A paper describes a structure:
GcoA possesses a broadly hydrophobic pocket with the two oxygen atoms of the substrate coordinated by backbone carbonyl and amide nitrogen groups from residues Val241 and Gly245, respectively. A series of hydrophobic amino acids is responsible for positioning the aromatic ring, including a triad of phenylalanine residues lining the active site cavity. Close examination of the GcoA-guaiacol active site shows that substrate binding involves interactions between the peptide backbone and the substrate hydroxyl (ring C1) and methoxy groups (C2). The ring C3 position has a relatively close (3.8 Å) interaction with the porphyrin-γ-meso carbon that bridges the propionate-substituted pyrrole rings. Demethylation of guaiacol, which binds tightly to GcoA (KD = 6 nM) was then monitored over time via NADH disappearance at 340 nm under steady-state conditions. The same simulations also suggest that the active site constrains the binding mode of guaiacol, so that the methoxy group points toward and the hydroxyl group is oriented away from the heme iron. This may forestall the lower-energy cyclization reaction pathway predicted for guaiacol by DFT calculations.
ATCC 39116 (encoding proteins with accession numbers WP_020419855.1 and WP_020419854.1). Unlike other known tetrahydrofolate- or non-heme iron-dependent demethylases, which are fairly substrate specific, the P450-reductase pair characterized here (GcoAB) demethylates diverse aromatic substrates, potentially providing an important advantage in both natural and biotechnological contexts. GcoA and GcoB operate as a multi-domain complex; guaiacol is processed exclusively in GcoA, with electrons supplied by the GcoB redox machinery. While the organization of P450 systems is diverse, the architecture of this 2-protein system, combining a catalytic P450 with a 2Fe-2S ferredoxin domain in addition to FAD and NAD binding sites, represents a new class.
Residue numbers in the entry: 5 to 407
């Protein structure tokens, strides 16, 4: 209904999945808060608007429509008040920095070595499938208590959940355009239940050091546990983004480094630059690109738009992280950018709970990769395609090295 934005009626879901940055460049200039018809929602595209909405007292969390169809209730990302406080209290212990520092090295480093050992003498690899994804999922899976679930299965689950969660397209009547696209998310959930229900049965009676056992038991009266239906949606939140994103982020960081060969060389020579390299990678291609949202709780005016109460706004943090109000030439990867604030972990009460853990997973993985293969090069015969609007990352990363 905004006349000057009639061009947005012609934006497609496929276009946004393939490459959302041209449309979002226009949005940041034309309408930092804009209703995108194919998404069925207002979208926040700039750093100022995303930060304002994420931190405003007049907004609260809401799950996106496709996210809710995928995860149900109470997903930690979609709830507020006492339920959110309890779910944050449940997930935070293992994520506390002092706690992560106690065990993160002995968790991730042997995992990274195990996956490297499989290919480090080959002279070629596709790092998304052979390294970045397995290390990310094996690390978190072991932390959670899912040691027995193979990395290939954790990877399949996150991919199916991604596609269902981001199945956001709506038709001319505001109805989901592709209802069949939720079926694979439902199938993943059914598989997850079949594996995890017996584990929860065991943990209720026999608590252990796994994170999910602690989710059941922590803070509960004697002999009581949180109901499994109450915790499953947050398990699904983990089995999508927490499993997927460290792998996404380390792979994007590698693509960015390969794009600046002098910078790759600096980081291989001086691995203390790895954290900076990662932070720039997350800004450059944000793993959680436009997955979350907030909803107004009263009438508000944001970026000149008067919103009624009850209005959802999607937080396109991956666009915010290319805001030219903040960054020069944001589509260029540059290790030597000054260490400015970014929105790849969101903001406010619903900001990422796992930042410290995620940063260490990616750091340790990259350290081990460069120690193992110091002469790592991108295989320039192959293209790198990035995919995703809700969650974004490279679909492959072919590399080569002299053996
Ligand atoms: C590089 C990897 C990661 C990125 C880029 C990422 C980014 C994000 C973003 C953007 C959000 C939404 C914040 C908002 O709406 O303002 C989020 C939420 C979340 N993150 Fe992460 N994160 C990643 C890894 C993880 C990991 C590994 C875990 C768990 C161990 C995790 C746990 C969560 C939780 C629990 C939430 C929901 C917080 C809430 O709604 O209260 N994160 N993260
Ligand atoms: C940490 O996992 C998520 C974050 C935001 C949206 C969906 C997720 O699975």
């Amino acid at each position: 209904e905004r006349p000057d934005l009639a061009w947005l009626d012609e934006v497609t879901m496929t276009q946004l999945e393939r490459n959302p940055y041209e449309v979002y460049e226009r949005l940041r200039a034309e309408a930092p808060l804009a209703f995108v018809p194919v998404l069925g929602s207002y979208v926040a595209s700039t750093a100022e608007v995303c930060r304002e909405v994420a931190t405003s007292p007049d907004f609260e969390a809401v799950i996106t429509p496709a996210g809710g169809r995928t995860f149900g209730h109470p997903a930690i990302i979609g709830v507020n008040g006492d339920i959110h406080a309890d779910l944050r209290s449940m997930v935070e212990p293992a994520l506390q920095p002092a706690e992560v520092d106690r065990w993160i090295d002995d968790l991730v480093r042997p995992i990274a070595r195990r996956y490297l050992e499989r290919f480090e003498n080959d002279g070629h690899a596709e790092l998304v499938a052979q390294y970045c994804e397995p290390v990310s999922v094996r690390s978190l899976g072991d932390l959670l208590g899912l040691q027995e679930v193979d990395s290939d299965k954790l990877r399949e689950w996150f991919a199916k959940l991604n596609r269902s969660f981001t199945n956001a397209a709506v038709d001319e009547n505001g109805e989901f355009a592709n209802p069949e696209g939720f079926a694979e998310g439902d199938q993943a959930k059914a598989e997850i239940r079949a594996v995890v229900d017996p584990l929860i049965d065991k943990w209720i009676e026999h608590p252990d050091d796994s994170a999910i056992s602690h989710w059941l038991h922590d803070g509960m009266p004697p002999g009581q546990t949180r109901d499994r239906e109450y915790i499953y949606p947050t398990i699904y939140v983990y089995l999508l983004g927490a499993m997927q994103e460290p792998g996404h982020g380390m792979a994007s960081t590698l693509v960015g480094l390969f794009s600046r060969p002098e910078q790759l060389e600096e980081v291989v020579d001086d691995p203390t630059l790895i954290p900076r390299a990662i932070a720039e990678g997350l800004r450059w291609t944000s793993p959680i690109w436009s997955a979350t949202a907030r909803i107004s709780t009263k009438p508000v005016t944001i970026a000149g738009v008067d919103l009624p109460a009850g209005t959802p706004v999607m937080l396109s943090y991956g666009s915010a992280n290319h805001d030219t109000g903040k960054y020069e030439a944001p589509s260029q990867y540059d290790l030597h950018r000054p260490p400015l604030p970014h929105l790849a972990f969101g903001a406010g009460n619903h900001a990422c709970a796992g930042i410290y853990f995620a940063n260490h997973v990616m750091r340790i993985a990259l350290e081990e990769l460069f120690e193992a293969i110091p002469n790592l090069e991108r295989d320039t015969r192959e293209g790198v395609e990035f995919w995703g609007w809700g969650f974004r990352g490279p679909t492959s990363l072919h590399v080569t090295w002299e053996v």
